[PDB]
Amino acid sequence: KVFGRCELAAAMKRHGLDNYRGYSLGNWVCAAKFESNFNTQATNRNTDGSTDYGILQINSRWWCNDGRTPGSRNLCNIPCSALLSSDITASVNCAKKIVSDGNGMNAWVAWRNRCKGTDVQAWIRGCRL
Ligand SMILES: [Cl-]
Ligand SMILES: [Cl-]
Ligand SMILES: [Cl-]
Ligand SMILES: [Cl-]
Ligand code: NA
Ligand code: NA
């Protein structure tokens, strides 16, 4: 599914991401835009052989099992394919574990390079939430 901007913000809000660990909703919308262009079916291979899945590009090196990332972990305890669903629950619940792992949203390179230090509230401007 390709979400609209405000549609995704509302879904993320209902799943408890607004100010989760102190990250306002616009941070999560901005990260999703630059990680996946709001497309739940986004996949992207990494140089080390791991793959990133779904709207928040969660990587199989640590967080999910795809059966083809040798020597990896599965700390969200889910198949990576679950992260491609039009239902974002699994992506959001796994993201809550990632953002709590000590580095906050710096775990998402695109967030650090494209969202951090910008006016992220613009990403939710106009939305009925
Ligand atoms: Cl947009
Ligand atoms: Cl914030
Ligand atoms: Cl959903
Ligand atoms: Cl933090
Ligand atoms: Na915001
Ligand atoms: Na894995």
Domain residue spans of the chain: 1-129
Q: How many Cβ atoms are within 10 Å of 75's Cβ, its own excluded?
A: 13
Of 7, 18, 48, 52, the catalytic one is 52
65: helix, strand or coil: strand
Resolution in A: 1.4
Distance 128 CA to ligand 1 centre (A): 15
Query: 45 pairs with which residues across the strands?
Result: 51
Q: 79 forms bridges with which residues in the sheet?
A: 65
Query: Which letter does DSSP use for residue 30 in this model?
Result: H
7 is an active site residue: no
Torsion sign, CA atoms 82, 83, 89, 93: positive
Beta strands in 48-115 (DSSP E): 51-53, 58-59
| Greatest C-alpha distance within the chain | 45
Indicate if 66 belongs to the active site.
Answer: no
Ion ligand 6, residues whose Cβ is below 5 A away: 60, 65, 69, 72, 74
Method: X-ray
Q: Are 64 and 76 in contact (CB under 8 A)?
A: yes
Which of 7, 18, 35, 66 is flagged as catalytic? 35
Determine if residue 101 is labeled as part of a ligand binding site: yes
- On whether the 1-129 domain is CATH 3.40.50.10420, my answer is no
